[PDB]
Symmetry: D2
Subunit: 346 residues, 4 copies
């Protein structure tokens, strides 16, 4: 009898089911209110019912809950100060996808040492998200697979599907059943069609495989997600300017989906240079002042301390993509608030 099963598998270990984490860390009344309200506020921006600017802002990746919470406390002050112009939500992404081998993020490898203590990672991720919502700071994340959402999607006010997965049938099927609004990034080399197609597909009912809250293999039947939109993040060339926004809007209208979109100030739009995020933001600010009718949001990579480092040595500094520091964040947010204040006069 020749072996055919699990030939290239080192180990398959049981995980605690979602319901174990939900039992220890139930969503509170106040967190559930914030999540509910923020999802609705964001849908209003997606569909042009309100003209505040969504701002998804925070670290490239979370590697230290302490720093994240300090960041959120500073950010909360500005979320409140600018609440008539901006809808500020913290970027709480646990991993950056990789081609070359490297750190698998705070959920998969919380101890930053290759031990892959995923039960601890998921618990810590849920704990941080609950703490954020409890302090008044809504959270956003990218969903990389079809199982992690069951552990903490209830605490997420906006979700992303990344460039590497926007075209994936199963990730679009996932998006169609996510409780939050969902942004789809354009493709790595700039392809907008995959994102426009994703919004259309995610609006419909689908089935996909995942687990129950009790941790058992399941088929999920979704209702469709009416609150999806594109995220422009460059690729071919940066696509943040008025010309590119106009062309994307045209193509969105041709497909019969929302022509309100988000612009990422970082990644391929900054050309991996954190010092250009302000320049992109300045360009968007000028669009918002002149007209900017198709913009509903921006994304910004921001941390306590600017730049990046290979090892987690400096407190509050990214170990993935380089981020603007806190002082520059204050400036960038003041810029956008002032420009959108003007746009809202119309």
């Amino acid at each position: 009898h020749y072996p055919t099963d699990d030939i290239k598998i080192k180990e398959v270990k049981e995980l605690l089911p979602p319901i174990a984490h939900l039992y220890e860390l139930p969503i509170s009344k106040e967190a559930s209110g914030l999540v509910h309200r923020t999802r609705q506020e964001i849908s209003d921006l997606v569909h042009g019912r309100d003209k505040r600017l969504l701002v998804i802002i925070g670290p490239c990746s979370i590697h230290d809950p302490k720093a994240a919470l300090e960041y959120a406390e500073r950010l909360l002050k500005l979320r409140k100060q600018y609440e008539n112009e901006l809808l500020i939500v913290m970027r709480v992404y646990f991993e950056k996808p990789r081609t070359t081998v490297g750190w698998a993020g705070l959920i998969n490898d919380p101890h930053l040492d290759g031990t892959f203590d995923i039960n601890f990672g998921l618990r810590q991720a849920r704990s941080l998200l609950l703490s954020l919502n409890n302090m008044g700071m809504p959270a956003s994340t990218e969903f990389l697979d079809m199982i992690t959402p069951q552990y903490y999607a209830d605490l997420i006010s906006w979700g992303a599907i990344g460039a590497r997965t926007t075209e994936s049938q199963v990730h679009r099927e996932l998006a169609s059943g996510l409780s939050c609004p969902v942004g789809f990034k354009n493709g790595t080399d700039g392809n907008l069609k995959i994102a426009i197609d994703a919004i259309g597909a995610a609006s419909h009912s689908h089935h996909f495989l995942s687990v129950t809250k009790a941790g058992h293999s399941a088929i999920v039947h979704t209702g469709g997600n009416p609150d999806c939109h594109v995220i422009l993040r460059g690729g071919k060339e940066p696509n943040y300017d008025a010309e590119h926004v106009s062309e994307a809007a045209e193509q969105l209208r041709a497909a019969g989906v929302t022509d309100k979109l988000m612009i990422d100030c970082s990644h391929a739009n900054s050309r991996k240079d954190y010092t250009r995020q302000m320049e992109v933001a300045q360009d968007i600010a000028a669009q918002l002042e002149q007209d900017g009718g198709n913009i509903m949001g921006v994304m910004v990579e921001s941390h306590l301390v600017e730049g990046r480092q290979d090892k987690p040595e400096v407190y509050g500094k990214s170990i993935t993509d380089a981020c603007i520091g806190w002082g520059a964040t204050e400036e960038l947010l003041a810029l956008l608030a002032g420009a959108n204040k003007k746009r809202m006069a119309r």
Copy 2:
């Protein structure tokens, strides 16, 4: 207390676990032998140790197990006839990914009527795959998600990751733990870099989330898959010709991965016209006759009857992509066997 969980979910239904199907349909001694041997024979092609041509050939999708088994019976005679020149493996794909709403395939919706009887669909797919191996025909399939392989990957001799998922981090993590060799298709518009990158990534150990054979949420730690290769399937223009093969081989060598590749005669290489598959095969044959050192395999969409139909009215005729019929299949295989006989004799 505001609701925040499963807001856009119609139903979450626990499935029978893999162990239930494996009890009803254990892999036989004969089927285990065939799978084990075929996986090794393919590894030998991927790594240039044998110069037979792998031929992945069969329906675009399986919608009728009766027709599939009939097809396999005919194909088996040619698998045997050409065993010194070609390694013939049946294409056994249960679904074609969609953008616009349509049939979800024989696993998800086996009754072709929107009932989504997935417990029946998984049973039936396993049964067909066991029957195929038991008759002496190895099987191949595309893995669209991270859970289905637990139900039947033990019966699969060669696996594919399609154009829409080659770039996906989690689908590369999956491939790194698949027991079979894996082909990665180039991107929808022709992007080969994603597939080259994929082979590299898939050769390493990774972690991803799935279920145990008992159906429980799990973390999977893989060993890496040394037997991955790219599949040329066209883009904006076809990419089957010697010039494209030569450049792909140089890029594969530049990345330090295998420079032996597979060419799809169908999909974008046929410009979506089943009558052009033979012309692609004729070009491949000329390449093999002249040199063709970088070719290890071909893919062909073939069925009992040529063409396609919207409803399953005609027996043995595709309801997804149009396929060549049985007579043409005999001719195309004869063509490839003859050309490769000459390549092998050098």
Copy 3:
């Protein structure tokens, strides 16, 4: 230096297929469902004195061969019909007999009779037999020895037992309080009736106990109570089947405020462990029914195709646990009881 403290004396823990895997392959039919539902109600009617037919739980000590069980049931079915106005005949379908010294663990635990313990196959085979019996028109009965097996096949059971060794057990009484079927509690090994009277009372109330869901996951079960429990007299140090003993049991049952209708086992300790004495017990019960017998609602008999017992399964239709009466004796015993109860019912 973590010292080991978990599973120190465990050779292996293996996953079982969940109940729902067996239910998927072998769903209860519409016919079987009807028979189970009506037979349970018919038995309730006997327990509560609303009908004077005699329940007869009859068949092998233990099932070790499905073929012989189905042949047995075909023969018995003819008599179930013939005597339907006097007797309510249900086949005894017990897969195991409990042991103190090591021996065969029964057809569910060790279906292949060779210590391989292929329990997935054993449970499937048990469910298949029970479904086949109900489909042919023969209702089935069984003894429940643990709190998990009922999820696999209790839906096919018309009458359940809790044995002498478990009647006093808190958890087995909790189980009984949630079983869909009527339940008989055997008196204790040495004759103790009090534990069975107490069990009927306890089992009538709502309880909670641990088990598994149909999907096979650890679970707490909250029951509604079982109003259809009764005692089973099966002897002790002395047999307890005679009129004096039945009259005493009924006084104690009424004193406790629970049903004073009971079942009498013709086998085991009432037969003094001798299969050739079952008829004597049945003849004493016949005489009670003719004279009065108002407190008897049923009897239990160990019966097979072929009389006696054997130490290896060589003779087709012959017990490998307790010796049983053969088929010809089974015809005689049932004829005897039907005649006697016809007279009781006419009064």
Copy 4:
């Protein structure tokens, strides 16, 4: 279709699996050492290698973890003081079995209000047991079913099977795979044969049904438990005296099993008068001074405050069987330590 399934069931609710509790409350290195060594120490008493007296002492039932921990802190001082004569282990029983309807114990109904919050119950039981072991106090309990051991038996140094279940085949099968030594109580009316038979059965390998640590329906194959003994707890008349011990010992030797036994001072030996436990203990002390070679242990129902109460009003006072209070406990342990010192000196 007539209904036949779960006719008389109000609800079936899935529990958190053992792995969830094990994650929150892993056994510590120190606790694992205490458990491991205490089990071996008790095995030594069972097999007559050591002549210390095992003392299983504590509340009839635990209804308040705070009182239990306070009790343990006081008892630990005496465990240490008398460690050369007595092996003191705390009685940590969560439930007393009932015939008439009443409180189902701290695991099944921790809130003492009929809410049956068993997930909270199991967590709290495990938490108390871990705390006890961590402070240096080993714990003992009675196992009433075949599932609860999966949640906390790793923390138990000695286990009991009670009078109502000693004869049960499945409870004997359970005992045959318990990691701790096990005492079997004589039957309600005094029957010793069921406990002698239980020791023999439990020494052998058995199979029984339960759940895996992940909570899945399982078959358990045991190795046999060589460390079982009887517990004399009275019958129609008490059975603690020299004459009864002598007779039980003769029957044990006749059966070929250990003739070292435990005597319960409470229950049907005190005839449910807590003030008689000291009288039983005095008789046992006299046996130990004179010969007492078959006695390996005693059991005593003891709490902070003597007596019992129907509602949990007074702190540290039983709501199940009446117990001796702390002062009487000090006296009883001093008495037994002195008497066994003389026994061991022979």
